[PDB]
């Protein structure tokens, strides 16, 4: 095998690193995280111009056709800079449409590539919230559909032109495209842990168009993989910052990084991140081979949800007082890692879902 990025993805990684580094400064983050949209619109525009919105999307749509691994390289760099833009909701939605959408829906994708059209995904509900069995209902309306129900904390909803909403129709769970101005659709802005502005969506017989019959299980697995990629970047950036901090911070006449207990917490972070990374790329390779049993994506997401949350808790404790200060960078990684580790369910929910797939695959 091979555990190295090729030429193209390494180039992509460097371009994403430069752009996130240019924009995700202390000053910009503070302004964006207190704005009405909570979205860095300047960064979004630089990503579009640089080709990064299109790199994972089909060539027909004006993108590069590099697919899921391209998206994960970009999302890892995003996480490393905790930069606030709705990359995974827009680009996961865009990939769902490229793969399972009608020709009409694929006409949306050039606008995503050039940066004028943002999307989001509404995959969660309050309460039990089984993402594979949405409570939200889809009722046929001639050749289209109408949706009724509620979706919880839909990410980065401000300025989204379209939503992919999961719902249950007469033939089971599905994924439906909804325009953000559609009649009967409303939401309440709600602030999340990461300081994103999400929306709690109310759907009163909202008109919608179905994607292909396989869209929802496929999309849940791609979203789990994308979230793992963000969390890998979050955990990696967090460890890097903490390491540099502890080399310099002295107590008792020596750097804190000379204490054996400190070195072991750092080493445990390092181990968790390495495990997270191999399990992420296994999920990417499984997606490439058309795997549909969903195991590899859940392994990857569990590592994100358990190991990744472990890392940002350690990097919080190791900083002591300075790490609680919102004018110091590390608290943001805790915020991101905390929120990502519960997105589409937490670690325990993943282990239950994964254990059922193992049992069903055994028989």
């Amino acid at each position: 095998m091979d555990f190295t990025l090729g030429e193209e993805l390494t180039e992509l990684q460097g371009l994403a690193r430069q752009i996130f580094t240019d924009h995700a400064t202390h000053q910009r983050l503070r302004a964006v995280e207190t704005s009405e949209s909570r979205i860095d619109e300047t960064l979004w525009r630089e990503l579009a111009g640089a080709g990064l919105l299109g790199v994972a999307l089909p060539e027909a749509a004006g993108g590069a056709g590099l697919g899921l691994g391209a998206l994960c390289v970009l999302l890892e760099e995003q996480g490393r800079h905790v930069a606030p833009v709705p990359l995974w909701p827009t680009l996961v939605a865009a990939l769902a449409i490229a793969e399972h959408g009608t020709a009409e829906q694929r006409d949306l994708l050039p606008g995503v590539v050039d940066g004028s059209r943002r999307l989001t995904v509404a995959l969660e509900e309050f309460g039990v919230g089984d993402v594979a069995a949405p409570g939200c209902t889809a009722v046929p309306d001639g050749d289209g559909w109408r949706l009724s129900g509620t979706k919880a904390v839909v990410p980065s909803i401000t300025g989204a032109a379209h939503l992919l909403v999961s719902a249950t129709g007469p033939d089971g769970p599905g994924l439906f495209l909804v325009d953000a101005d559609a009649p009967g659709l409303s939401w309440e802005r709600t602030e999340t842990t990461s300081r994103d502005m999400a929306g709690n969506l109310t759907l009163d017989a909202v008109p919608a168009r179905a994607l292909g019959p396989a869209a929802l299980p496929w999309t849940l697995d791609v979203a789990r993989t994308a979230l793992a990629a963000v969390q890998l970047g979050v955990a990696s950036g967090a460890l890097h910052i903490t390491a540099s901090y502890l080399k310099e911070r002295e107590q008792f006449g020596r750097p804190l990084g000379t204490f054996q207990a400190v070195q072991h917490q750092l080493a445990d972070c390092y181990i968790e991140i390495e495990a997270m990374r191999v399990c992420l790329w296994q999920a990417v390779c499984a997606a490439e081979d058309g795997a549909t049993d969903g195991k590899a994506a859940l392994v990857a997401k569990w590592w994100a949800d358990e190991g990744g949350l472990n890392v940002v808790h350690r990097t919080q404790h190791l900083h002591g007082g300075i790490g609680v200060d919102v004018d110091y960078p590390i608290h943001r990684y805790f915020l991101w890692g905390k929120q990502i580790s519960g997105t589409l369910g937490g670690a325990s929910a993943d282990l239950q879902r994964l254990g059922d797939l193992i049992a069903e695959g055994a028989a």
Binding site: E124, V128, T192, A261, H313, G321
Partner: protein, 384 residues
């Protein structure tokens, strides 16, 4: 070997819970709990508690307090924090008791009555940018000038300095002595010329401060204990602080109980993974609840060991984080909603507490340092 609360304490506990939850409506109570000692209603709450006599509940009657037992004090500390209310712990549990033991008669008459009534609140000025876990290396300087000390330096994480009347300030009065023998405690009023503070906004919501001392002049008569004898004051009379911090666990029990009821009433409780997580956190909260009482009872009997204190603190604060992590998972999608936003579960308390619990593993003793103490003092290991 009796591990039950006596009926008297249970009655006291129910009466306090009714009072503290009635003091302010729930939503206002949540705000002031999040804002803590830095908040704009902190002094308002303290004054309410003073007027009702709760501040000196544990103080001896010869100093104006009610002289209640250590177990009753622990119940009070539990229930006030269980209601989400701030409490002036450093003033009542550190400053007050040290003045009772070491203050001159003038200092006792000047500070103790006002502390009892809630009219006087202190902030602790120990930590410096360069002296955190290694507090004995502090460099904030106090140079004697006749009957004043001239104080130059800066403190960081001076919680409550923005709402306090006085700073309880550890400073270096002898640069030549060994580091442990050149520190004094001096009381600095927060309206002193040359004193200032700047806010530090924490991820959990509360505002703490940095405080600065530029030629601040304080009478020599505001030194507590002996000049250069401060390190002993810093490192002793800690049992009240230990039980106040342990009492924080009572709110985590309350919130665990609230999530169980929440999960019961929307179906989440049917999921096996939810039942398992509730069970594990219940087992861990039981150990916490009982070890906290064992420590309180040891304090009441004057036989708490440093190893036990350190084991119990380290276990307790790390259990708060585990329960906060785990409960957030059980809340599902609403677990990420901040207080005051729609869809928040239990007013976002668990979401916010998770961003605050990450501070208590290094407040009240750094957990790595406590584990070293467990090994050397509890098990006889030679010091690392």
């Amino acid at each position: 070997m009796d591990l039950r609360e006596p009926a008297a304490l249970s009655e006291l506990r129910a009466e306090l819970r009714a009072y503290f939850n009635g003091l302010l409506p729930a939503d206002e109570r949540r705000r002031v709990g999040e804002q803590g000692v830095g908040g704009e209603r902190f002094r308002e709450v303290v004054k309410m508690l003073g007027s009702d006599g709760w501040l000196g509940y544990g103080w001896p009657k010869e100093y104006g307090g009610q002289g209640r037992s250590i177990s009753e004090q622990y119940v009070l500390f539990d229930e006030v924090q269980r209601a989400g209310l701030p409490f002036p712990f450093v003033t009542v549990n550190t400053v007050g008791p040290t003045l009772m033991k070491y203050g001159t008669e003038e200092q006792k008459k000047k500070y103790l009555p006002g502390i009892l009534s809630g009219d006087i609140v202190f902030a602790i000025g120990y930590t410096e940018p360069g002296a955190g876990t290694d507090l004995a290396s502090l460099t904030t300087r106090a140079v004697r000038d006749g009957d004043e000390f001239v104080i130059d330096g800066s403190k960081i994480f001076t919680s409550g300095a923005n709402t306090a009347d006085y700073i309880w300030l550890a400073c270096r009065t002898d640069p030549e002595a060994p580091k442990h023998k050149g520190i004094s405690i001096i009381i600095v009023p927060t309206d002193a010329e040359g004193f200032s503070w700047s806010p530090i906004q924490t991820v959990g919501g509360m505002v703490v401060t940095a405080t600065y001392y530029s030629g601040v002049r304080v009478p020599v008569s505001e030194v507590v204990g002996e000049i250069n004898g401060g390190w002993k004051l810093i490192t002793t009379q800690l049992n009240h602080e230990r039980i106040g911090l342990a009492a924080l666990g009572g709110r985590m029990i309350r919130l665990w109980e609230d999530v169980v009821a929440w999960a019961r009433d929307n179906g989440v409780l049917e999921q096996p993974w939810v039942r398992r997580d509730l069970a594990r956190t219940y087992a861990k909260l039981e150990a916490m609840r009982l070890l906290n009482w064992k420590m309180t009872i040891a304090v009441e009997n004057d036989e708490l060991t440093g190893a036990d204190a350190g084991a119990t603190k380290a276990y307790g604060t790390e259990t708060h984080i585990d329960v906060q992590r785990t409960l957030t998972g059980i809340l599902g999608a609403a677990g990420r909603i901040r207080p005051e936003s729609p869809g928040a579960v239990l007013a976002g308390q668990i979401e916010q507490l998770s961003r605050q619990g990450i501070v208590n593993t290094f407040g009240g003793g750094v957990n790595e340092v406590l584990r070293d103490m467990v090994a050397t003092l509890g098990l006889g290991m030679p010091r690392s």
